[PDB]
Design an enzyme around this catalytic site. Structure first.
Site, short mmCIF file in Angstrom:
data_model
loop_
_atom_site.label_atom_id
_atom_site.label_comp_id
_atom_site.label_asym_id
_atom_site.label_seq_id
_atom_site.Cartn_x
_atom_site.Cartn_y
_atom_site.Cartn_z
N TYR A 120 0.76 -1.20 0.19
CA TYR A 120 0.11 -0.07 -0.06
C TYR A 120 0.87 1.18 0.11
O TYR A 120 2.16 1.34 0.63
CB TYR A 120 -0.94 0.25 1.32
CG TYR A 120 -0.31 0.50 2.51
CD1 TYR A 120 -0.04 1.66 2.82
CD2 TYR A 120 0.27 -0.59 3.58
CE1 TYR A 120 0.47 1.66 4.06
CE2 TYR A 120 0.65 -0.40 4.58
CZ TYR A 120 0.95 0.92 4.97
OH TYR A 120 1.53 1.07 6.30
N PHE A 130 2.14 9.85 2.94
CA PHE A 130 2.25 9.60 4.45
C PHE A 130 2.93 8.44 4.70
O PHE A 130 3.77 8.45 5.76
CB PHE A 130 1.06 10.15 5.17
CG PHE A 130 0.13 9.27 5.19
CD1 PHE A 130 0.03 7.99 5.77
CD2 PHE A 130 -1.16 9.75 4.26
CE1 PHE A 130 -1.20 7.12 5.61
CE2 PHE A 130 -2.25 8.92 4.16
CZ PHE A 130 -2.22 7.66 4.80
N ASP A 131 2.74 7.32 4.06
CA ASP A 131 3.36 6.19 4.34
C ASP A 131 3.31 5.14 3.37
O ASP A 131 2.31 5.32 2.44
CB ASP A 131 2.62 5.47 5.53
CG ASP A 131 3.29 4.47 6.13
OD1 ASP A 131 4.59 4.25 6.08
OD2 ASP A 131 2.80 3.42 6.85
N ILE A 150 -8.56 0.66 9.74
CA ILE A 150 -9.69 1.62 9.63
C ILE A 150 -10.74 1.16 8.78
O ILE A 150 -10.59 0.22 7.98
CB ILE A 150 -9.10 3.14 9.03
CG1 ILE A 150 -8.46 2.92 7.70
CG2 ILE A 150 -8.07 3.68 10.04
CD1 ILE A 150 -7.99 4.02 7.26
N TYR A 176 -9.41 8.34 10.31
CA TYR A 176 -9.05 8.70 11.57
C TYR A 176 -9.72 9.97 12.14
O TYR A 176 -9.46 10.38 13.09
CB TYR A 176 -7.64 9.25 11.56
CG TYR A 176 -6.84 8.02 11.25
CD1 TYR A 176 -6.51 6.96 12.18
CD2 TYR A 176 -6.34 7.76 10.02
CE1 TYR A 176 -5.75 5.94 11.95
CE2 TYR A 176 -5.63 6.81 9.69
CZ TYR A 176 -5.21 5.74 10.46
OH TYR A 176 -4.44 4.73 10.10
N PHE A 193 -5.57 5.46 -0.82
CA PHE A 193 -4.51 4.60 -0.76
C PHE A 193 -4.49 3.55 -1.76
O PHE A 193 -5.73 3.24 -2.34
CB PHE A 193 -4.95 3.49 0.52
CG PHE A 193 -4.75 3.80 2.02
CD1 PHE A 193 -5.66 4.68 2.61
CD2 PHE A 193 -3.34 3.46 2.66
CE1 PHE A 193 -5.43 5.06 3.94
CE2 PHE A 193 -3.31 3.79 3.85
CZ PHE A 193 -4.23 4.55 4.67
C1 LIG Z 1 4.82 1.11 12.16
O1 LIG Z 1 3.56 1.33 11.18
C2 LIG Z 1 2.40 1.22 11.92
C3 LIG Z 1 1.48 1.32 11.04
C4 LIG Z 1 0.97 2.88 10.37
C5 LIG Z 1 0.59 3.71 11.69
C6 LIG Z 1 0.29 5.11 11.22
C7 LIG Z 1 -0.64 5.02 9.96
C8 LIG Z 1 -1.13 6.49 9.43
C9 LIG Z 1 -0.07 4.33 8.90
O2 LIG Z 1 0.97 4.98 8.43
O3 LIG Z 1 0.27 2.99 9.37
C10 LIG Z 1 -0.91 3.82 7.86
O4 LIG Z 1 -0.68 3.91 6.58
C11 LIG Z 1 -2.51 3.68 8.04
O5 LIG Z 1 -3.23 4.37 7.88
N1 LIG Z 1 -2.67 2.33 8.14
C12 LIG Z 1 -1.83 1.21 8.18
C13 LIG Z 1 -2.41 0.20 6.66
C14 LIG Z 1 -3.65 -0.32 7.11
C15 LIG Z 1 -4.47 1.01 7.18
C16 LIG Z 1 -4.18 1.91 8.18
C17 LIG Z 1 -4.62 1.28 9.50
O6 LIG Z 1 -5.81 0.79 9.90
O7 LIG Z 1 -3.28 1.33 10.75
C18 LIG Z 1 -3.96 1.00 11.92
C19 LIG Z 1 -4.20 2.32 12.74
C20 LIG Z 1 -3.02 3.31 12.73
C21 LIG Z 1 -4.84 1.95 14.14
C22 LIG Z 1 -5.91 1.18 14.22
C23 LIG Z 1 -7.15 1.59 13.39
C24 LIG Z 1 -8.39 0.62 13.73
C25 LIG Z 1 -8.75 0.80 15.05
O8 LIG Z 1 -9.99 -0.19 15.33
C26 LIG Z 1 -7.63 0.24 15.91
O9 LIG Z 1 -7.85 0.62 17.43
C27 LIG Z 1 -7.14 0.23 18.30
C28 LIG Z 1 -6.33 1.04 15.59
C29 LIG Z 1 -2.79 0.48 12.59
C30 LIG Z 1 -2.40 -0.92 12.00
O10 LIG Z 1 -2.76 -1.41 11.03
C31 LIG Z 1 -2.04 -2.07 12.99
C32 LIG Z 1 -1.53 -3.48 12.17
C33 LIG Z 1 -3.09 -2.38 14.09
C34 LIG Z 1 -3.39 -1.96 15.29
C35 LIG Z 1 -2.29 -1.05 15.80
C36 LIG Z 1 -4.45 -2.24 16.11
O11 LIG Z 1 -5.38 -2.88 15.33
C37 LIG Z 1 -4.32 -3.22 17.37
O12 LIG Z 1 -5.37 -3.03 18.14
C38 LIG Z 1 -5.23 -3.11 19.45
C39 LIG Z 1 -3.96 -4.45 16.93
O13 LIG Z 1 -4.80 -5.28 16.99
C40 LIG Z 1 -2.57 -4.80 16.39
C41 LIG Z 1 -2.75 -6.18 15.47
C42 LIG Z 1 -1.64 -5.30 17.49
C43 LIG Z 1 -0.26 -5.20 17.15
C44 LIG Z 1 0.49 -5.62 18.54
C45 LIG Z 1 0.10 -4.03 16.86
C46 LIG Z 1 0.63 -3.62 15.48
C47 LIG Z 1 1.12 -2.29 15.12
C48 LIG Z 1 1.41 -2.09 13.84
C49 LIG Z 1 1.71 -0.65 13.51
C50 LIG Z 1 1.93 -0.32 12.20
C51 LIG Z 1 2.00 -1.52 11.36
#
Ligand SMILES: CO[C@H]1C[C@@H]2CC[C@@H](C)[C@@](O)(O2)C(=O)C(=O)N2CCCC[C@H]2C(=O)O[C@H]([C@H](C)C[C@@H]2CC[C@@H](O)[C@H](OC)C2)CC(=O)[C@H](C)/C=C(\C)[C@@H](O)[C@@H](OC)C(=O)[C@H](C)C[C@H](C)/C=C/C=C/C=C/1C
EC number: 5.2.1.8
Length: 201
Positions: A120, A130-131, A150, A176, A193
């Site tokens: 993506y 932005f990413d 999201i 967001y 995206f």
């Molecule tokens: C370093 O890069 C970051 C990703 C960055 C963060 C900032 C954004 C601009 C961005 O650049 O991605 C981005 O491009 C973006 O907007 N994304 C990522 C690609 C998928 C779409 C979107 C998104 O939803 O991100 C997500 C967004 C930022 C936050 C979530 C949005 C949905 C909402 O319901 C959740 O509530 C909590 C939070 C981040 C993710 O895709 C990661 C995978 C998922 C989570 C963190 C949560 O689902 C969490 O809930 C507890 C989990 O169950 C996870 C699996 C637990 C494990 C340990 C944590 C993994 C963390 C991975 C973090 C990663 C790869």
């Protein structure tokens, strides 16, 4: 503005009538929305709204008013046929829109319990990136259906087949919202995206 107010209002008026059998409540949601139409559009976007939906909304209001004088539910049904058409059209510019860049196999779609493996690139509405997982030179993996990502991704990627590349345009409500993501995503940001579904695991 008018698009968002009518989208929220039609939904809420319909919940009151169909969900709660409350005609008075549905009227009291709709009437102010029609009243604000009557001053006329005052911006380019309100003008575009009026040109697209003004006539149908005016007709829907006339069916509502026929209902207050007939008590015939058929008149309300005709109103909601019009309101729903307006709602569906407004909805095409909100939520998530999926535009195919390159087709997939048209047959293999994400199922519950599976991990989606994607590439993506995320950009702001102007086009500022932005990413991108493509910059990290490795695919992004996640699972659908558990609010991991999201809402625009939950709804958008679920419609893609393996191999498909698509552009997801995601309204702030499906991304967001008012908070944004501090340091990366501003408040009230529409996101675009470029997503390619590579495989299901
Ligand atoms: C370093 O890069 C970051 C990703 C960055 C963060 C900032 C954004 C601009 C961005 O650049 O991605 C981005 O491009 C973006 O907007 N994304 C990522 C690609 C998928 C779409 C979107 C998104 O939803 O991100 C997500 C967004 C930022 C936050 C979530 C949005 C949905 C909402 O319901 C959740 O509530 C909590 C939070 C981040 C993710 O895709 C990661 C995978 C998922 C989570 C963190 C949560 O689902 C969490 O809930 C507890 C989990 O169950 C996870 C699996 C637990 C494990 C340990 C944590 C993994 C963390 C991975 C973090 C990663 C790869």
């Amino acid at each position: 503005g008018w698009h968002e107010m009518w989208h929220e209002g039609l939904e809420e008026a319909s919940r009151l009538y169909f969900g709660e059998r409350n005609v008075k409540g549905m009227f009291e949601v709709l009437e102010p929305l029609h009243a604000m139409m009557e001053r006329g559009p005052q911006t380019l976007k309100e003008t575009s709204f009026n040109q697209a939906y003004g006539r149908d909304l005016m007709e829907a209001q006339e069916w509502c008013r026929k209902y207050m004088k007939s008590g015939n539910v058929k008149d309300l049904t005709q109103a909601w046929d019009l309101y729903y058409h307006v709602f569906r059209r407004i909805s095409k510019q909100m939520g998530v829109q999926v535009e195919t860049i390159s087709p997939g196999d048209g047959r293999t779609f994400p199922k519950r319990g599976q991990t989606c493996v994607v590439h993506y690139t995320g950009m702001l509405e102007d086009g500022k990136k932005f990413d991108s997982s493509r910059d990290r030179n490795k695919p992004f993996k996640f699972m659908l259906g558990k609010q991991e990502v999201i809402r625009g991704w939950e709804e958008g990627v679920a419609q893609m087949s393996v191999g498909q590349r698509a552009k997801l345009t995601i309204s702030p409500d499906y991304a967001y919202g008012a908070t944004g993501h501090p340091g990366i995503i501003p408040p009230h940001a529409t996101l675009v995206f470029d997503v390619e579904l590579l495989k299901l695991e």
